[PDB]
């Protein structure tokens, strides 16, 4: 099982202001710690690609993407795919990464999007996925502005399709502190809900298969109850297996 | 009258660029110093909670809140309540501040929202109140995006209910330089208008009474003329009095 | 025939924070974005006043009589906030005439208005240009989207003439590629002359005595390609459209 | 014992860049809350002043300052004192706070400076105390530039006068992760050292007693070992008592 | 009298953090609008070159600079001259603007430098002129770091050579709120001092004449008193006339 | 030949202000991709550690560094080595990276420092190496502040020891757009000069060998002329060999 995992990286610039003055500290992080560990011990072969790597060296032809059984996109916005460094600074004409991913799915590849501030529409609608060529590929329809539902008190998932292969045999469903609100396309399969909204949704796109998980795999939307839940590793392994190219 | 007044505080970081170079200066400031003085001189006992205080120490129990007759919210966005520091950084599960306020009004508490860049939807829709559980509490319906109406040339408030107890006897209404555009709910009372949009609106949410002032109590939208208006204190005192716990 | 045009916008001030591990140094960079275009209009006989964004903040004309001297006003890559929230308004507590009202009255009374697309035009990036929620929306011959209205095409797509006999574009050929545009809907009132990805690209209208135009992509990179800049009809396009909508 | 404790507060300013895009996060924090609570529980009456308050509301009269037995300055640079908002933005003439403090010590009051990134010279020499009218008041002589000594390995303190009233009885000296490098003046008593540099130093300036602790009372220089060290509270209580106006 | 006036412009990026959220406003200002009016009213022919214009369009050859009798440098650091856009971003090799200026003074041109945060050494020594090829042209010797003397209390200027043609028949000198501290030079003439440091200094460099005014022509160091002083226009016109190309 | 190459990486966050408004674009870049490729093709086996990796994963063990024949430090400041994430954010005691590097060289390892804004002292003295435990290892003595010499007009390298093994045979020396200014130690060998200042210096520290190259390997200081100079690879390959363990 060959998986391309894109995103879950950030560069924080901190300005510490003390009265009149300030000094800065800068940091690089990667965010999918418990998830990529769970996937690796679960038999998945991950090629990890940080957001900044998309900007410099996203594959220019579909053949390179074709080796992957699933592509995962998490906490990385459409602007990163569409406005690669060569496009935005170097005045080049470049192949469209999102059309590439679209073609990839058309011809058999799986696609998962995991929720977050830079997934779907996201914080201040920055992820902007709705207004891109990738919107039609996805089994949910996005809202037109900021789509976050913030639940700092926590709220739990429900199985609505408990007999579905991905979640059959699961129970005692965990709690989340937020998600992106979207509306499942009506030909899609909703498997888990949250707060009267979809949480886990499967669809199809020509030959390929699609999944959306509307919450996060890590903090803060993903809680301790979530990552310690007996069925955490199986959720992500099972969803990738379900949508993998055959 | 005991009143909790939340917001009207900011930390400015200024980056001054002179050609190639830049130096910084930083500045904390409070915005409704005049208003709070007028309210205290009109006999109101005010507990002032600046925005950073919400982040560190917002009351977790409705019992703490129930000792207030009115809570006022001005220039502080929904994210500040929902994403407190223990939530966003320390990975804690925290009671929901907006639910707490919602519960407080439910049980006889009065709620005022004052307009500004960080009220209602606000600049770039950053206040984002429409997409929250507090939306249902307010006597107005907000727009889906940035809801500012900028009027640098100034427009007058107009009284469409000159007889309303809160505004009775006022005259010579002042000029404002902008407001948040919203739609008064069907069951709410429009007392004042601005550019024919609602300006002062009153309503109910179970046992509690609600109010929205659609422009600012402070500059630049709340003008010098507004702040030194004879009815300025009356306006604000009368409205707290009107929606106070009975 | 002899055009006096006010060209507003097409300037910016980048602050760059260069983070190297723990540390950062900064460099700050002014640029102007339409030097090429302005040179072409100069050579094509247009009398141009250039007003960068910062100059609208300090010194936008308060008098309509002062605007009335211009045959056309061009707005490009400058947001509505810049016009509405001049320094005296936002910092200095003054009442001040509304720049967008002034522009509106200038059009009502026979002035021309051209808006050129970009990140700080129409709605633009993150909807910051925000023109739909301003008193200028009714003046334009297009209806904007409710959010971010960019269509990014890194692979490029070419413009197409849907009214190739229209005076402005008559005789043009070999239309160039663009890397993006602002998506809008033409008023069913207006004349769509060029399209891009089947969306309007060049649109003409009227507003009381004045005449209006919208070009939905950029005059400059990255949306305006080098191919577009050196396209044989670049000059005539902008010159003809200025001339089409000019006062008289 | 009546003490004016200045500083140990900051606002960050977090820019989170995920590929092309970024979103921001902001928080105010206070660094010495438990220390301050420990001082109050140990009989010290504290007026606490976050750095931003210094810019808004610093005492202009000598008589106001004279009511304090000690003033403490921690992680707030000279610019904050010299460039209050009325000076830097409001273009008003106003009393010099550093002259006020210097005058306060002449008249008998105690002064302690705790090290950190915005004490002494500090990071990029931004604190800049050496170039101010307060330099002559301090019992140490500062470097010409950035005076940090970073010790991420840790280094333990050392008593050179273990018999001094302030540190008599103390034992098991904890580690620090750094300090500001300076030189004790000839007329000054060095009580603790750090990597052979002064760590704790007492002196006099006319009637007033003075003190410098060269590391931080807080993270990260003040280690967890230091926070929890028996005598940690005693160090602070003792040095305050020692330098206090009687 | 033909004069090139460089600097006195900045672009400010303001980050207004209201709790979790922040909004931004950017602001361009020119700082010597008043000075330039006074100078042109004194019949000086001024070409004004903002800092950003130096970045983008500084004259490449000395011929163009020689149309000026004096060059004035105010609140623009040496990095702006040394690191123009083509140099720093476009990989081009180009003429050294600081060398050009120095050559200009060498062959008759006059040079005045006016103090500020981006003059001489300046705030955090960012202006950095001491470490440049221009330092030897100036009739003062700078300090090795931050050279600001901050005087929010105010200090008046004092004439030590009232007989000098520049200040003849000036009296009642205004207050200033700070200045850059420098020394000497031995063969230079100090006309005004400030807090016993030089304020207005004249010297020469080969054929050209030089001047340094150590404080600001503008706020906040240059107070509104100074701005409204009857000899404000006379000071600047006389200094310019005194150093103009003979 | 086994070489650890550290630095030459940065994340840019760009704030584009157009009038009142701004949008942001961010990008990670690497600056020595060319050099690294040249060195690979020239028989050097490189482990490349970008700055952010030093913050997360710097060899705690002196035995880890001992596997390397040379360590190269370029455009990365002392602070990054000293203030790794677990030091600065988590509150953990860590081995001192600079002490490790010193021990490493002391025991026979090679050390090359390449010039730029975040080397030696650098821009605003930010690299700060002079005030660290690594300073005594380097074969040069650094200035006390900003040590840049900007030469936008270009300046040639010169050979002063043409017969030195590192440069023997080189000719037609390229032009540089700047360098850090330092002074060679008496016991060290100066092989190349720039503007009469040292450009290439070799030394020893106990068993180990040291090199310093005072200009940049990359733009803008390192011109296109330098980078495509026939001896470009030989310069770096030769210097690595000359200082290699041993």
Inter-residue contact E178 to E151 (CB < 8 Å): yes
**What is the distance between the alpha carbons of residues C240 and C204, in angstroms, rounded to a whole number?**
12
Q: Which of B9, B10, B15, B52 to mutate to test the interface with D (most CBs of D within 10 A)?
A: B52
Half-sphere exposure of residue B40: CA atoms within 13 angstroms, side-chain side: 11
Name the residue in chain B with its Cα closest to that of C147.
B145
Residue D37 sits at φ, ψ, to 5 deg, of -70, -40
**What is the distance between the alpha carbons of residues C7 and D225, in angstroms, rounded to a whole number?**
65
State the CB neighbour count (10 A cutoff) for residue D30.
15
CA distance A209 to chain B (A): 31
What's the token pair of residue C179? 């890397």
Residue E31 sits at φ, ψ, to 5 deg, of -100, -10
F82 touches chain D (CB under 8 A): yes
F57 touches chain A (CB under 8 A): no
Question: How distant is the alpha carbon of residue A131 from its chain centre?
Answer: 17
Closest partner CB to F95 (pick from D19, D153, D177): D153
Burial of F29: CB neighbours in 10 Å, binned 0-12, 13-18, 19+? middle
**What is the distance between the alpha carbons of residues D229 and D223, in angstroms, rounded to a whole number?**
10
Inter-residue contact D149 to D178 (CB < 8 Å): yes
What's the token pair of residue D161? 């006068």
CA distance F222 to chain D (A): 27
C75 beta partners: C8, C115
- Residue B27 to residues C117, D51, D86, D141: CA-CA distances in angstroms? 36, 10, 11, 30
Question: Would strands A208-213 and D208-213 be described as parallel, antiparallel, or unpaired?
Answer: unpaired
Q: Which residue, among E124, F222, E37, F173, has the nearest Cα to D125 in the 3D structure? A: E124
State whether residue C136 is helix, strand or coil. coil
CA distance E28 to chain C (A): 6
A154-167 burial code (b ≥16 CB/10 A, e <16): bbbbebebeebebb
**What is the distance between the alpha carbons of residues C37 and C218, in angstroms, rounded to a whole number?**
11
Residue D186 sits at φ, ψ, to 5 deg, of -55, -45
C99 chain-B contacts, CB cut-off 8 A? 152
Inter-residue contact B125 to B147 (CB < 8 Å): yes
| Chain E touching partners, 3 or more CB pairs below 8 A | B, C, D, F
Inter-residue contact B28 to D52 (CB < 8 Å): yes
**What is the distance between the alpha carbons of residues B18 and C56, in angstroms, rounded to a whole number?**
19
**What is the distance between the alpha carbons of residues B85 and B207, in angstroms, rounded to a whole number?**
31
State the CB neighbour count (10 A cutoff) for residue C170.
12
A113 beta partners: A73, A212
C149 chain-A contacts, CB cut-off 8 A? 131
Cβ–Cβ below 8 Å for A52 and F27: yes
Inter-residue contact F60 to F101 (CB < 8 Å): no
Name the residue in chain E with its Cα closest to that of C90.
E25
Q: Which residue, among D119, D174, D129, has the nearest Cα to D151 in the 3D structure? A: D174
Tokens 């157009």: give the residue.
F18
CA distance E75 to chain B (A): 8
Q: Which residue, among C112, C98, C82, C62, has the nearest Cα to C213 in the 3D structure? A: C112
**What is the distance between the alpha carbons of residues B125 and B129, in angstroms, rounded to a whole number?**
9
Q: Which of A10, A18, A82 to mutate to test the interface with D (most CBs of D within 10 A)?
A: A18
Cα-based angle C83, C86, C89 (whole degrees, multiple of 5): 125
**What is the distance between the alpha carbons of residues D47 and D61, in angstroms, rounded to a whole number?**
16
Inter-residue contact B226 to B151 (CB < 8 Å): no
C128 touches chain A (CB under 8 A): no
Cβ–Cβ below 8 Å for D153 and F99: yes
D20 chain-F contacts, CB cut-off 8 A? 25-27
| Chain D touching partners, 3 or more CB pairs below 8 A | A, B, E, F
Which one-letter DSSP state was computed for residue C138? Answer: G
Inter-residue contact D136 to D168 (CB < 8 Å): no
C22 touches chain A (CB under 8 A): yes
Whether the bond between D157 and the residue before it is cis, its omega within 30 degrees of 0, is: no
| Domain locations in chain C as residue ranges | 1-248
Between the two ends of chain D, the Cα-to-Cα distance in Å is 9
Closest partner CB to C78 (pick from F18, F118, F127): F18
A11 beta partners: A28, D17
CA dihedral over A49, A54, A56, A61, signed as positive or negative: positive
Cβ–Cβ below 8 Å for E23 and B52: no
Name the residue in chain E with its Cα closest to that of F222.
E91
B127 chain-E contacts, CB cut-off 8 A? 21
Between chain B and chain D, how many beta carbons pairs sit less than 8 Å apart? 31
Tokens 């200014």: give the residue.
F181
Inter-residue contact B182 to B176 (CB < 8 Å): no
Question: Would strands C112-116 and C210-215 be described as parallel, antiparallel, or unpaired?
Answer: parallel
Between the two ends of chain E, the Cα-to-Cα distance in Å is 11
- CATH of the domain spanning C1-248: 3.40.50.880
Q: Report the CATH fold assignment for E1-246.
A: Rossmann fold (3.40.50)
Whether the bond between C114 and the residue before it is cis, its omega within 30 degrees of 0, is: no
E26 chain-F contacts, CB cut-off 8 A? 17, 19-22
Name the residue in chain C with its Cα closest to that of A125.
C126
Instruction: Report the 3 state secondary structure along chain F.
Output: CEEEEEECEEEEEEEEEECCEEEEEEEEEECCHHHHHHHHHCCCEEEEECHHHHHHCCCCCHHHHHCCCEEEEECCCHHHHHCCHHHHCCCCCCCCHHHHHHHHHHCCCEEEEECCCCCCCCHHHCCCHHHCCCHHHCCEEECCCCCEEEEEEEEEEEECCCCCCCCCCCCCCCEEEEEECEEECCCCEEEEEECCEEEEEEEEECCEEEEEECCCCCCCCECHHHHCCCCHHHHHHHHHHHHCCC
Which residues fall within 8 angstroms of residue D118, CB to CB, at 6 or more apart?
A: A18, A21, A23, D7, D75, D76, D77, D126, D127
- Residue C9 to residues A100, C33, F20, F89: CA-CA distances in angstroms? 35, 9, 12, 43
- Residue A20 to residues A189, B11, D7, D137, D147: CA-CA distances in angstroms? 56, 11, 12, 22, 20
F225 touches chain D (CB under 8 A): no
The secondary structure element, H or E, covering residue A62 is helix A62-66
Q: Which residue, among F104, F100, F112, F83, has the nearest Cα to F8 in the 3D structure? A: F112
Q: Which of C28, C59, C130 to mutate to test the interface with E (most CBs of E within 10 A)?
A: C28
Inter-residue contact D114 to D145 (CB < 8 Å): no
What's the token pair of residue B201? 């609106």
What's the token pair of residue F171? 């000719």
CA distance F28 to chain A (A): 6
Inter-residue contact D1 to D41 (CB < 8 Å): no
Cβ–Cβ below 8 Å for B87 and A20: no
State whether residue A193 is helix, strand or coil. strand
**What is the distance between the alpha carbons of residues E217 and C242, in angstroms, rounded to a whole number?**
44
Cβ–Cβ below 8 Å for E177 and D93: yes
| Chain C touching partners, 3 or more CB pairs below 8 A | A, B, E, F
Cβ–Cβ below 8 Å for C29 and E83: no
D85 chain-B contacts, CB cut-off 8 A? 27, 29
D61 touches chain E (CB under 8 A): no
Whether the bond between E185 and the residue before it is cis, its omega within 30 degrees of 0, is: yes
State whether residue B183 is helix, strand or coil. strand
F147 touches chain C (CB under 8 A): no
Please report the DSSP string for chain D in residue order.
Answer: -EEEEEE-EEEEEEEEEETTEEEEEEEEEES-HHHHHHHHHTT-EEEEE-HHHHHH----SHHHHHT-SEEEEES--HHHHHS-HHHHTT------HHHHHHHHHHTT-EEEEE-STTSSS-GGGTT-GGGSTTGGGSSEEE-SS--EEEEEEEEEEEESSTTSTTTTT--SPPEEEEEE-EEE-TT-EEEEEETTEEEEEEEEETTEEEEEE-S-SSTTTB-HHHHT-TTHHHHHHHHHHHHS--
Tokens 């000359």: give the residue.
F242
**What is the distance between the alpha carbons of residues C51 and C36, in angstroms, rounded to a whole number?**
15
CA distance D127 to chain E (A): 10
Inter-residue contact D151 to D145 (CB < 8 Å): no
What's the token pair of residue E68? 């000026």
Cβ–Cβ below 8 Å for A12 and D16: yes
Inter-residue contact E138 to E213 (CB < 8 Å): no
Resolution of the structure in the document, Å: 2.2
Question: How distant is the alpha carbon of residue C167 from its chain centre?
Answer: 21
Question: How distant is the alpha carbon of residue D183 from its chain centre?
Answer: 16
**What is the distance between the alpha carbons of residues F180 and F198, in angstroms, rounded to a whole number?**
9
Q: Which residue, among A139, A174, A167, has the nearest Cα to A238 in the 3D structure? A: A167
State the CB neighbour count (10 A cutoff) for residue E223.
21
CA dihedral over E60, E61, E67, E71, signed as positive or negative: positive
A25 chain-F contacts, CB cut-off 8 A? 83, 88
Cβ–Cβ below 8 Å for E131 and F148: yes
**What is the distance between the alpha carbons of residues D198 and D177, in angstroms, rounded to a whole number?**
15
Q: Using CB atoms and an 8 Å cut-off, which of residues 87-116 of chain F contact chain D?
A: 87-88, 91, 93-97, 99
Cβ–Cβ below 8 Å for E93 and F22: no
Question: Helix (H) and strand (E) counts for chain C?
Answer: 8, 13
Burial of C194: CB neighbours in 10 Å, binned 0-12, 13-18, 19+? buried
Cβ–Cβ below 8 Å for C154 and A82: yes
Inter-residue contact D157 to D173 (CB < 8 Å): yes
Please report the DSSP string for E59-76 in residue order.
Answer: -SSHHHHTT-SEEEEES-
Q: Using CB atoms and an 8 Å cut-off, which of residues 160-219 of chain F contact chain E?
A: 175, 177, 219
E128 touches chain C (CB under 8 A): no
CA distance D58 to chain A (A): 12
Between chain A and chain B, how many beta carbons pairs sit less than 8 Å apart? 56
A117 chain-D contacts, CB cut-off 8 A? 23
Beta strand segments in C64-121, E: 72-76, 112-116
A84 chain-C contacts, CB cut-off 8 A? 154
- Orientation of helix D33-41 relative to helix D232-243, angle to 10°: 70
Which residues fall within 8 angstroms of residue A159, CB to CB, at 6 or more apart?
A: A167, A170, A171, A173, A191, A192
Instruction: Report the 3 state secondary structure along B101-165.
Output: HHHHHHCCCEEEEECCCCCCCCHHHCCCHHHCCCHHHCCEEECCCCCEEEEEEEEEEEECCCCCC
Cβ–Cβ below 8 Å for A152 and B94: yes
A9 chain-D contacts, CB cut-off 8 A? 18-19
């Amino acid at each position: 099982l060959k998986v391309l995992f894109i995103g879950e990286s950030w560069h924080i610039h901190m300005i510490h202001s003390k009265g009149y003055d300030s000094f800065t500290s800068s940091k690089y992080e990667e965010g999918a710690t418990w998830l990529l560990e769970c996937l690796r011990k679960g038999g998945v072969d991950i090629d990890y690609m940080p957001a900044h790597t998309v900007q410099i060296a996203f594959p220019e032809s579909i053949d390179e993407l074709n080796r992957y059984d699933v592509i995962v996109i998490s906490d990385i916005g459409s602007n990163t795919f569409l406005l690669q460094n060569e496009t935005f600074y170097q005045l080049k004409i470049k192949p469209n990464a999102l059309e590439s991913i679209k073609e990839y799915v058309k011809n058999g590849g799986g696609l998962l999007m995991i929720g977050g501030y830079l997934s779907f529409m996201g914080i201040e609608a920055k992820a902007n996925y709705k207004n891109t060529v990738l919107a039609e590929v996805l089994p949910v329809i996005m809202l037109d502005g900021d789509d976050r539902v913030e639940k700092p008190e926590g709220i739990c998932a429900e199985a609505v399709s408990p007999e579905h292969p991905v979640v059959n045999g699961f129970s005692d469903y965990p709690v989340f502190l937020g998600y992106n609100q979207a509306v499942a396309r009506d030909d899609a399969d909703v498997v888990l809900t949250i707060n009267n909204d979809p949480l886990l949704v499967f669809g199809e796109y020509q030959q390929g298969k699609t999944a959306c998980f509307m919450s996060d795999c890590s903090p803060h939307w993903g809680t301790q109850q979530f990552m310690s839940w007996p069925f955490y590793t199986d959720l992500w392994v099972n969803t990738l297996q379900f949508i993998a190219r055959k």
